[PDB]
Nucleic acid binder design. Sequence first.
DNA 1: TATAACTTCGTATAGCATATGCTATACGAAGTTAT
DNA 2: TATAACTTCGTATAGCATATGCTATACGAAGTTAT
DNA 3: TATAACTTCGTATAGCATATGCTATACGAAGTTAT
DNA 4: TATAACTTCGTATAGCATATGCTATACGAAGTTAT
Lengths: 322, 322, 322, 322
Amino acid sequence: SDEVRKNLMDMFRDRQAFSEHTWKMLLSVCRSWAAWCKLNNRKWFPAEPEDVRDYLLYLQARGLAVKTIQQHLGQLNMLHRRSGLPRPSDSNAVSLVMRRIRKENVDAGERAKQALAFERTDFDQVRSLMENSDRCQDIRNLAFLGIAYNTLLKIAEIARIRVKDISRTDGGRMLIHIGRTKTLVSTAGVEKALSLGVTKLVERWISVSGVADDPNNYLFCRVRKNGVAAPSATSQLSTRALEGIFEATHRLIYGAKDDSGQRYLAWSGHSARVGAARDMARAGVSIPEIMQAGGWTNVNIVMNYIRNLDSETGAMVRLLED
Amino acid sequence: SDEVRKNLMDMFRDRQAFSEHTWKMLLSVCRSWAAWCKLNNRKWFPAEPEDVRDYLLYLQARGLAVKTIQQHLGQLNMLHRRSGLPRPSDSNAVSLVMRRIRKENVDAGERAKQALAFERTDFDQVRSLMENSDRCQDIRNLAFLGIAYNTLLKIAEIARIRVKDISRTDGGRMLIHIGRTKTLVSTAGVEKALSLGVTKLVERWISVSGVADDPNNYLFCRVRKNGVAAPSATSQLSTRALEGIFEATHRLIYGAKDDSGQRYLAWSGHSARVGAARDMARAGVSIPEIMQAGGWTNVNIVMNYIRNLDSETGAMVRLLED
Amino acid sequence: SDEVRKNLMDMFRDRQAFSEHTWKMLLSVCRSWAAWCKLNNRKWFPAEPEDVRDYLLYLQARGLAVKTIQQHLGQLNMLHRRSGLPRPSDSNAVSLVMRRIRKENVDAGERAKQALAFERTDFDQVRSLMENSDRCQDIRNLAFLGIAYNTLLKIAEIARIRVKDISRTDGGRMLIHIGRTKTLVSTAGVEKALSLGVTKLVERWISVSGVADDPNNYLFCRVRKNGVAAPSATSQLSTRALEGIFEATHRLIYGAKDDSGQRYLAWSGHSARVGAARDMARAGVSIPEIMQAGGWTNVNIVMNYIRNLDSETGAMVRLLED
Amino acid sequence: SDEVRKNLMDMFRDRQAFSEHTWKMLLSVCRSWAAWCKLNNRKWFPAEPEDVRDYLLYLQARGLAVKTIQQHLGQLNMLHRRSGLPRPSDSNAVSLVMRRIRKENVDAGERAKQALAFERTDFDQVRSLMENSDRCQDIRNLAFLGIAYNTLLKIAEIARIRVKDISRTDGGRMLIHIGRTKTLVSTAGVEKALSLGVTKLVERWISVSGVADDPNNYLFCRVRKNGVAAPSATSQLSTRALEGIFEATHRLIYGAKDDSGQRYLAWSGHSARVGAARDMARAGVSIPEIMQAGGWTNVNIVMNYIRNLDSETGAMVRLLED
DNA sequence: TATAACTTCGTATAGCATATGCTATACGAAGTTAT
DNA sequence: TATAACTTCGTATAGCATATGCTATACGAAGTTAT
DNA sequence: TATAACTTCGTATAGCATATGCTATACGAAGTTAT
DNA sequence: TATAACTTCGTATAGCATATGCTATACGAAGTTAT
């Protein structure tokens, strides 16, 4: 009783031990759960196994994805475990209902998605077009897409790059030091090398932006309607802005998005990562080098990116034809 | 006791958490476990570790495989876990016998088996014997073998195919939209494409069967003693019937089975998957290309299917033959 | 008290859960320990931390290797843990003394050894010589050394091979199915392929021995002074005999062993394994293929086999010379 | 309390279980931990988790690296474990702050450093400036840099070399028998070979120093202000002096240090190991051949040393430059 | 002034790393239904 | 006391999966600020 | 008959797979000893 | 209250290791059995 209050207070005290995104989702699920409780006059904490089961079933009925329902159950599980109480998943009622919800939906044909690919051809086409622009905005967006495709870095890591994090090989190629990504330990970090062509795109961006006037400035910053860039060492270009670049670029070439409300109708933050992976896959690059390139320590996500590649349509056929 | 009553109720309520195949195996083990308990005067529920141990050794003496003995222990473990009772595997005595049983059987030379390969040489020899037959069942069976060997799909998957899953793509070859995954993080479906010679075979069956009349009709259907097919959209061919096509085709060429009681003396549901990988490998297709063929994410099984091929003899044989 | 008696009785009951070699060493250490106790009128079980420390220190003084002292402490640890009592290593006195004993000895220059290499050149030289012999004994020994070098299998696995475990690729190469080695799980097992030349050596051995007259016969058997081989399906050629073949062969070419009492003065059961590894290492075979060949899932033992190879003496030197 | 008294006695008795360097760091952390406790009025022993947490945050605010903060926690953990008390790391509060401290510092861009490379271009430039000097200390320092760069040995290892460790092997180049391992399962020693131009350098130092008179004399020795060397077999040159040769040689070419207080502004003990790997890699030597060079079993560190080389830019840079 | 180009924000869902049994084919044989 | 051609069963054994804990992206929408 | 060619056996030590912090270099600065 | 050239210290931070649990080989020596 007074012990649960402590563990909770201790978790909040050292919040920063967790990603801000984890806390955001924690509070978001809690809102959903509490709201569902208030409406069935149930106690939201500690949660009762039979109530959690009903809630999960309620989520499934709302039509949410299996992965989304796993998130809600998961946040609940952490709140309880980290407080010293047994997890809702510790009961057969909740554990069996999750299995059932996943089996049913998957049986109904539910399948997780992934970003629309941004490959070499796309990058070449975009470059052939924006190359001739003098606008600070265009020069920045081309440099960004360039680094994204070349390095496979996620939008959060690219937004974190500081001017001082850039070096150069003796061949003239730029180097980008990366320290906190989405996984890894000592603090030695890694260096991402840019091709001769892509370093040129970035160089032009540095020149027209003036972000180099201060090393602790972030590489990318905003550019206002009048074309003046606003370097900053305390503010990064929001990852939301970085997704807008991918989307605006897709609109530029293919026009306005559909009206189906669907996800992945245009390029997004992850497009260059999946497109590059599948360009290498097709190039014959080795599994280890690919994993090296994208920073993977496994091979699953990789395998998934080739799945559906047109270049993997099939062998058995010409195998029968002679 | 009130506790286990609640748990059993939990299990019945969310019984969809497990597939029916799992339930049959569960009931199957419980029946054998209980019969043994009656005959040997022991309580079957809850199961005591010293009793489970005497039974596991009883199975070993019955000459069952290690895989089979692990199934009985596994189901017994499930029954107890989903009942709120401790699992038999968590006791010292049971943990020791399983370890000792596994050690002894492997040391006595016990080995897992796998389907008798059905390769091209076989498909051709079959096609050259059936090809011209005008019998409905002959025209159907050839179309099945072709798809099985072409697509590498399992029998349950071939049973589900509806007429409305076959479209036209590239050269007017047939295309089959399927689903070969059952996990959240996986590909919802997939498109198996057929060669030309195989697409024809399917064309002739569809035209003599009549399953085309209704798009929701299953591609493969029953064909009675009069040589008449019976299209349906409510019932598909049993996987047992599909396995029967494989054995009947073997009889056709080699006659009555070897009677030794052994397994895989003729072709079975997986015969074509074993053969397709060996033929594919013999041509030297990309490892991943062979994996996309059968839907593998790893090579543990495919490696098993091609083990005895000369292409897989290794570096030492390579160094020795200078 | 009565509980410790049970766990022990349970361990002995299911002895077979452990390798016979483990039990042998268990009983051997127990003899050493009990003997040391009887001599200092100490109680051998349960063992007292301060007594175990004194015993370990006593072992070090006797001049035994660090690895040998780790074995004694280890058997003691298992006896106690498996009985339900805390392990002698659970105390700082014992845990600190082991660290110290290892540090001191290693500081004094103690270093673990490894078998004298039996490589390709050696195999060619031996073959060039024994090839022309008509003796059943010579024909058997050449076939054995051949399979050893070609497959890298340990002496225990080679001794276990049954006539029925041999198949052939369509290229004419022999195949040897291996099921229990020194690690691995399902019961599918593995197949070791022999080069065309080595299969010929084995074929000749089968022909002159007649071990094929029964499939459940072990491939290798003894050969008496009059040259008559004695096939058997219940007895294998002792691994001790297999080490004698390596040693006799070394004597045949280099003469009688030294008189230093040292280990690894002649070829032993592991020589072909370390020699083959280092022939591949030198051949440029890939780390994964090598590990594949020797059955390794890591890379440490491998790295150790090249260490000291003459072919790895060094780069920095010619790096400075121009 | 009687219990911890016994444990501390255990630790003192078998103090050889840890190296003196470990003990110094232990005493160093205990001193700082206690001083802080006095100033902040908390008991230093046993250490309470809420107190340890306030101290860990105190270190972070002192601006210490994550590695340093882990050392203080580590030693505190050792002190308690070897005392029979619970370890600070095993408490929720401490586990949370360490996680949060590590997250924050990495996110603020904290990075591990490594020695300023000392490459061939440097060795040549140094040799071309010293080569002809007739000063004892000059003739010694050149011999040290040469061996350091040639052998890739660490400073403690170069300090241990005795005259009786250098023999003649192949072309009359010098050979150095060393020991660079400190684990049971490892190579007891090793033979570092020197180029011709480097073997000469060592020859001249030995002839002007006189360490040869006694084989048990350390290769490298003191050289006073009069330019006279002082061979000894009881005392070796401090590793601090060896580090001093590296900095003095840097001063020689580039002058006074940068004063910013930063680390690795000039060469240090590991400068030659970083440079040797980069030069070696630049020539394209076998990865394993580079590993045997510096005595590595993996590539985690070597990969760090060569990160910014053009040869290590990756597959994407490769695909992009068509 | 309006407005580009963002930033912040909340709900929905993918990425990724580590630990752990459920689900499908095999096949003899009994049961079923239309020739 | 038909039988071809199935389908349904029960039990043995082969073929790959799924649950965990967090951290990060997806995208519409409301708020912000230098032009 | 003797004896090759083993087999069994007990003590010593390597092989191998999985989980977990100790040990060495960095460097300013204080202490030391022979020019 | 010299100073070059060290060595000894204390504290910060980089470089890889070691303890576990079993299972398998190394080799001299005593016992075995068909010649």
